[PDB]
């Protein structure tokens, strides 16, 4: 493939137009009073929406290069949300902010290496400021507090959320399932979770969630890398007539057997999905075992001779539910005998006796947790199935923020936090004057979100911003009501975590580009 | 296929533009403070990186001719790394350097034949200087020294490395495997390695390594050239239901049987691969046998009436691991009985008795080495699987440098070594004035690397350069810290070997072009 | 002293000159910076590091100056490398006089192509 | 009028092609085995001469730059004629010669100005030399 290559500005300029489109298109939907975009559908009526994430999703430019600039931002702005539960848009918004000015600078004659530096500093600093302004969130009060708010006033919501963490703890594993009746339901059942995503997006069966919810399927607990499909035939057929889904866990899965299942499911007979096993080497050993224990499943170790073909349903584990995402698998209610489960615990416990290491003791400990800890579940009750599934949505939302609120507390959410921090370190200087500018850009860029909101609301940016600077603390302007005050008291905040994330990520990519000197791609 | 043909300048000019792109695109990533390039991915988000090798890899121009110019460089610049473990980039940088000037000269009216000559001399000379500047690396001190440095300060690293060579020797065969737990592990086990690369890139299962790692596969020991696939069917199926990979070794493999496997593997059931056997003629005989011994495998000699269809696993050898690269195969832990293995040694050892030649004694000797010498292994220990495989990487890196460091010592690594040597032979003259110029170009070209770094760091090239010329020895400028001093003491060096390699290779190709008068290619 | 040493010299002398506000200080710094132009253009017309010489020249005092013709430093005067004070002064003034304005352009009008 | 400026090598090259054209056109007529050139004329019939300067004058190039170089060398061929009405072709040859080499050396990276001097001196030297050889006719 012969490539097309651009340098310096030629390159940067493309990148800039590329990004702008993305940002100019997704930004108009920021405020609570955001405007809407129309996403043309191939089949049927177009789609109107104010959800940046969706908008962003659809963006792809013809001009490669320009398109790269766009995809580059989207990538990290996504990562932002990935590791915070929101900000996706905001990040993008800042992204532009920085990139724009700083990119003019580089092009103006100033040194790029410094500009980046100056910025990073600004960010670094503001990030602290954020830590300062952040208001803790620890007691079940604060918890239900933030929850009910992020659930949009609905107190009942914030309630359960507090209850939940109040059961399995803050670090406890909580999940949601549509309610069976009109009442909400919080229950704790033998269950577990671990960081390990699916090996194929084509597994997702819940598009809007990018997740894979499975109904009381069987569970496979191998101990080798499954490349060839063969081994499965026995079991894969058992579950075929078993009329139930099936999940897999082992070293990994090569396309030979992998690529096959992917299609085998995407419009196929038996529809299943799998994910690598937690831990590596020696660790995985017990790890998987723990799971077997919990699901009442049999572990297939080749270090025992037993092969896959040499296995029947009697060897599979079971749980009533199980969901996986881009990078995490979590089971619910495993059929493992309490006697068995509880016993295993005893085992581990003892093992922690060795205490021969704080890493080994910490380790064993962690397993103890997963296994004996359990998994809290909720069932969004509701009158109509609409409200039902709708509310359910709002719930999963809140929970996010809440976890986040817990982790890093929260702050003013109208773009306020940023304005604040910026006005703060307004002297902050750098060595090279090219670094000062670097810092300005950075700071001035933080005004972005707020100004944009106001803008989208049809209000005076410069004016609102100004008066917001004036006050202090979490004193801000509620775009939604056009009233200033304590954004937090007014129920307008952002999990400290996300705001940072957003801002860091945007900074990241920005400099990244500001330091880019070449771009390669295919020819039109 | 009708070709398109260009001459003299028409030819050279294309070659030049061609090369430039490659170098202008790859050079910006040189310093420790290099800028980054964006490599557009077909599916998904583009890739940002500062790794020249990667960049280079992607470069391919539309204009054939210009594209040749590029590939020509890439080829030899790769060869450089191939035979030194690094420089890939640097070589390229220099490559340009020379080519640019010398190519102006030719086009200016000066004689090409001399220009080349004048350069080669300059190189030749400078190469020596390097020998002088080179600082030995032999004691386990210097060994763990460089290692840990190249490992990026991490002392534990340089450690094992020195330990390793301290086991099977400097010429010993060392390998790396992921760690099972958190602890690093160094173990010596029956194994072997030899210069013989895969017969198909479509065998690589480790893309970023361009190598093939196979899990305790079976091993075949043929004795003929394998053209037809038939013979395999018995065994090919035995190992197919054996659910294990499989390696092969014989005279060679014609596409008939070759091409098949390649596909049979690239998205196929039984995934395997093979490589030619070491030694040629009489040598290969025993050569392979030794291997049988070690792997405990059976040798299929047609000179025995034994065929391939006539063969079962009982005839296959085995090892816990094995990896092949562009041109080197190496096994890990053969299942052959020490009894056997050690016994074989007795045989050979005796055989050396003849010692009827310093080639024959040397030869039998070498064999002994491989077989009884053993292969040292390492298991990069780590907390996270990330750091794990990451650290694993840095290790293999360092290892390289070290081997080289050993081989030819080391020198100032900020492009320093070159500046030095250049300022040295600054009088050096040639017969034809067209040779003097030849020499200048060469010399002035050696300032390229340093100058580029300074440049990439946003610093004054001309200035730093100057002051570095001033000092002497390994006195240089650390771009990473912006402090001059003893680059070596400051932990900034380059295995004498690579620096030479790089420089020589660049020189090679440069004149090669400067002496090119015609170019043939297909039509657009 | 020629070789554009005089200027580069007076530049160091105003290293502490300041104005009513920051922008203005930059404005000043800008100008002093530019006074190294003559010198290093000369150097550059000799295929030599404009920045390297300039440095060494700035390291010196009085009429220490690089001699482009001889490619060696020394006293510009003893070397008979003299610039009539008047020109040196006019060059700086006239140059600034326009430059100054020029950089305060925000809009420009002219006919169509 | 709007100009078109060219620097260094590009400029030079053009300039040289310009010289060459002229030169090459006047060389042909050098010596006993010298050949003729035909200068067209809207006036009457074309002109056939072996007079170097006659030729020079007629040369004008479309390429503004190639033309410039031509328009310059043209003067040596010229002045040489005002001086002693002969040797014109010859003179030209030397320039063509000098310049070719000269540029090549500038291309070599030498200071042109010294190149100039080296040549100038080399010449002043050459002159006495001749005055030495000159013997009374
Ligand atoms: N028979 C000859 N053999 C060799 N050289 C000759 C002969 N006759 C003349 N020449 C040389 O050729 C020169 C060039 O003559 P010509 O073509 O008229 O050029 P120009 O117009 O410069 O005199 C004379 O000056 C003389 O040196
Ligand atoms: Mg004559």
CATH number of domain containing B289: 3.50.7.10
**Is residue D30 within 6 Å of ligand 1 at its C-beta?**
yes
Token output for D10: 């590009």
Do residue A46 and residue A140 come from a single domain? no
Q: Which residue of B has its CA nearest to D110?
A: B437
Any residues with CB less than 8 A from the CB of D3 and at least 6 apart, and which? Answer: none
Partners of B250 in the β-ladder:
B276
Q: What three-state secondary structure class fits A136?
A: coil
Residue B470 shares a structural domain with residue B357 = no
DSSP assignment string, A179-193:
-SSSS-EEEEESEEE
The CATH number of the domain where B105 resides is what? 1.10.560.10
DSSP string, C3-65: TTHHHHHHHHHTTT---SSHHHHHHHHHHHHHTTHHHHHHHHTTTS-HHHHHHHHHHS-TTEE
- Which of left, alpha, beta for A210 (phi over 0: left; psi -120 to 50: alpha)? left
Is residue C15 within 8 Å of residue C32, measured between CB atoms? yes
The structure was resolved experimentally with: X-ray
Can you say how many angstroms the Cα of residue B26 is from the centroid of all Cα atoms in its chain? 19
From chain B, the residues in CB contact with A74 under 8 A are 45
Contact B269, B244 (CB under 8 A): no
CA-to-CA separations, B396 to A522, B157, B403, C81, in angstroms, rounded: 33, 10, 11, 61
Q: Are B456 and B35 in contact (CB under 8 A)?
A: yes
Please name the residues in contact with C6: beta carbons below 8 A apart, sequence gap of 6 or more.
C83, C88
A330 forms beta bridges with A193, A323
Same domain, yes or no: B286 and B421: no
Cα separation, D14 vs D67, whole angstroms = 8
In this structure, the answer to whether residues B393 and B428 fall within a common structural domain is: no
Among candidate residues A9, A23, A6, the one with its CA nearest the CA of residue A112: A9
Tokens of B516: 């090119």
- Same domain? A206 vs A355: yes
Q: How many CB atoms are located within 10 Å of the residue C112 CB?
A: 3
Taking CB atoms and an 8 Å cutoff, what residues of chain D touch B109?
A: 100, 103-104, 107
> Do the beta carbons of residue A493 and residue A482 sit within 8 Å?
no
B70 in Cβ contact with B57 (< 8 Å):
no
Ligand positioned closest to the Cα atom of D37: 1
d(CA A306, CA A234): 14
Element (H, E) at B56: helix B52-58
Total Cβ atoms within 10 A of residue B45 = 17
Note the resolution in Å, 1 decimal.
3.0
If you search the block for the tokens 């699916």, which residue do you land on?
Answer: A198
Q: How many CA atoms lie within 13 A of D55 on its CB side?
A: 27
What is the rounded CA–CA span in Å between residue B380 and residue B179? 5
Which pair of structure tokens corresponds to residue B413?
Answer: 């690594």
Query: Could you tell me if the CB of D69 is within 6 A of ligand 1?
Result: no
Locate the ligand 1 atom nearest the alpha carbon of residue D87 and give its number.
22
The C-alpha R_g of chain B, in whole angstroms, comes to: 26
- The encoded tokens of residue B260 equal 């098949």
How far apart (Å, rounded) are the C-alpha atoms in residues B256 and B227?
6
Q: H helices within A242-297, ranges in order?
A: 258-265, 282-295
Cα end-to-end distance, chain C, whole Å: 47
Kindly state whether residues B97 and B111 are assigned to the same domain.
yes
- Rounded to whole angstroms, the Cα distance separating A429 from A436 reads 5
Q: Are residues A266 and A359 in the same domain?
A: yes
Torsion-angle region of residue A333: left (phi > 0), alpha (psi -120 to 50) or beta?
left
Instruction: State the residue range of the domain holding B289.
Output: 191-371
Partner residues linked to A232 by β-bridges: none
At which residue do the structure tokens 């703060």 appear? A424
Q: In this structure, how many other beta carbons lie within 10 angstroms of the beta carbon of residue A313? A: 16
Contact A454, A465 (CB under 8 A): yes
Residues A361, A425 share a domain:
no
On whether both B212 and B321 belong to a single domain, the answer is: yes
From CA B281, how far away is CA B288, in angstroms rounded? Answer: 11
Tokens of A216: 């009381």
CA dihedral (A315, A316, A320, A325) positive or negative: positive
Note whether B345 and B278 are same-domain residues.
Answer: yes
Count the neighbouring beta carbons within 10 Å of the beta carbon of residue B43: 4
Domain end residue (candidates: B341, B371, B401)? B371
Q: How far apart are CA A148 and CA A256, in angstroms?
A: 48
For residues A446 and A450, give the distance between their C-alpha atoms in angstroms, rounded to a whole number: 8
Phi, psi of A247 (to 5 degrees): -115, 150
Q: Cβ–Cβ of C46/D109 closer than 8 Å?
A: no
Tokens in use for B23?
A: 């170098």
Give the integer Cα–Cα distance in Å for C49 and C68: 12
Distance CA B74, CA B80 (A): 10
Residues 6 or more apart in contact with residue A421 via CB below 8 angstroms:
A126, A129, A130, A133, A446
Our CA dihedral for B480, B484, B489, B493, rounded to 10 degrees, sits at 60
Please give all residues whose CB falls under 5 A of ion ligand 2, grouped by chain where several chains appear. D 86
3-class DSSP assignment, residue B163: helix
Distance CA A220, CA A246 (A): 7
* Integer Cα distance of B414 and B332 in angstroms: 37
Whole-angstrom distance, CA of residue A222 vs CA of residue A206: 26
Comparing CA positions, the residue from D29, D28, D106, D11 lying closest to residue D66 is: D11
**Contacts for A51 with CB less than 8 Å, ≥ 6 apart:** A29
Cα distance between residue A370 and residue A368, in whole Å? 6
Tokens of A45: 């009526």
Looking at B385, B409, B433, which one is the last position of a domain? B409
* Strand bridging mode B317-325 / B212-215: antiparallel
Domain total in chain B: 3
Nearest-CA neighbor of C9 among C36, C40, C28, C30? C36
Interval between CA D93 and ligand 2 midpoint (Å)? 13
Q: How far apart are CA B335 and CA B313, in angstroms?
A: 13
Q: For residue B204, what are the contacts with CB-CB under 8 A and spacing of at least 6?
A: B198, B210, B211, B212
Ligand 2 center–CA D87 separation, angstroms: 5
CA torsion sign for A475, A476, A481, A482 is: positive
Helix (H, G, I), strand (E, B) or coil at B177: strand
CB neighbours of D76 closer than 8 A, spacing ≥ 6? D91, D92, D95
User: Pick from B371, B400, B421: which residue ends a domain?
Assistant: B371
Q: DSSP code of A430?
A: -
What tokens does C7 get? 């200027």
> What is the whole-number distance in angstroms between the Cα of residue D60 and the centre of ligand 2?
23
Q: What is the CATH number of the domain that holds A139?
A: 3.30.260.10
Torsion of CA A395, A396, A401, A404, to 10 degrees: 130
Ligand 1 touching residue D34 (CB < 6 A): yes
Residue B183 backbone dihedrals phi, psi, to 5 degrees: -90, 140
Q: Are residues A433 and A323 part of one domain? A: no
Pair (A13, A141) in one structural domain: no
Q: In chain B, which residue's Cα lies nearest the Cα of C51?
A: B463
Contact A15, A72 (CB under 8 A): yes
| DSSP-assigned letter for residue A170 | T
Dist CA B217 CA B270 (whole Å)? 11
The span from the CA of B153 to the CA of B166, in Å, is 21
Tokens for B343, please give them: 């016994």
Point out the ligand 1 atom lying closest to the alpha carbon of residue D88.
22
């Amino acid at each position: 493939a012969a490539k097309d290559v651009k340098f310096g500005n030629d390159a940067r300029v493309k990148m800039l137009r590329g990004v702008n489109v993305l940002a100019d298109a997704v930004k108009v939907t920021l405020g609570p009073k955001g405007r809407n975009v129309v996403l043309d559908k191939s089949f049927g009526a177009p789609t109107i929406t104010k959800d940046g994430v969706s908008v962003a999703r659809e963006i792809e430019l013809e001009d490669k290069f320009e398109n790269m600039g766009a995809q580059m931002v989207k990538e990290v702005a996504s990562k932002a949300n990935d590791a915070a539960g929101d900000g996706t848009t905001t990040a993008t918004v800042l992204a532009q902010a920085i990139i724009t000015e700083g990119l003019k600078a580089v092009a103006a004659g100033m040194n790029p290496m410094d500009l980046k530096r100056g910025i990073d500093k600004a960010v670094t600093a503001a990030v602290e400021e954020l830590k300062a302004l952040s208001v803790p969130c620890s007691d079940s009060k604060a918890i239900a507090q933030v929850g009910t708010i992020s659930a949009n006033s609905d107190e009942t919501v914030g309630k359960l959320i507090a209850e939940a963490m109040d059961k399995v703890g803050k670090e406890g594993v909580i999940t949601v399932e549509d309610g069976t009746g009109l009442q909400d339901e919080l229950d704790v059942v033998e269950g577990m979770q671990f960081d390990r995503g699916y090996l194929s997006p084509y597994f997702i069966n819940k598009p809007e969630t990018g997740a894979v919810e499975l109904e009381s399927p069987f569970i496979l607990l191998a101990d080798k890398k499954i490349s060839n499909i063969r081994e499965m035939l026995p079991v894969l057929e058992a579950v075929a007539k078993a009329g139930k889904p099936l999940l897999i866990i082992a070293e990994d899965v090569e396309g030979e057997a992998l690529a096959t299942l992917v299609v085998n499911t995407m419009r196929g007979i038996v529809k299943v999905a799998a994910v690598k096993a937690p831990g590596f080497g020696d660790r995985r050993k017990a790890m998987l075992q723990d799971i077997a224990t919990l699901t009442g499943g049999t572990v297939i170790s080749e270090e025992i001779g037993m092969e896959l073909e040499k296995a029947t349903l009697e060897d599979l584990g079971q749980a009533k539910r199980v969901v996986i995402n881009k990078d995490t698998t979590t089971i619910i209610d495993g059929v493992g005998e309490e006697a068995a489960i509880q016993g295993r615990v005893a085992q581990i416990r003892q093992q922690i006796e060795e205490a021969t290491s704080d890493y080994d003791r910490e380790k064993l400990q962690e397993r103890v947790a997963k296994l004996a800890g359990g998994v809290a579940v909720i069932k969004v009750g509701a009158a109509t199935e609409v409200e039902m599934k709708e509310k359910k949505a709002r719930v999963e939302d809140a929970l996010h923020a809440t976890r986040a609120a817990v982790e890093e507390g929260v702050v003013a959410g109208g773009g306020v936090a940023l304005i604040r921090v910026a006005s703060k370190l307004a002297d902050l200087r750098g060595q090279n004057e090219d670094q000062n500018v670097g810092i300005k850009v950075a700071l001035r860029a933080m005004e972005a979100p707020l100004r944009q909101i106001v803008l989208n609301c049809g209000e005076e940016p410069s004016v609102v911003a100004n008066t917001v600077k004036g006050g202090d603390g979490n004193y801000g302007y509620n775009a939604a009501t056009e009233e200033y005050g304590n954004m937090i008291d007014m129920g307008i905040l952002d999990p400290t975590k996300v705001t940072r994330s957003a801002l860091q990520y945007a900074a990241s990519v920005a400099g990244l580009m500001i330091t880019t000197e070449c771009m390669v791609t295919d020819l039109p």
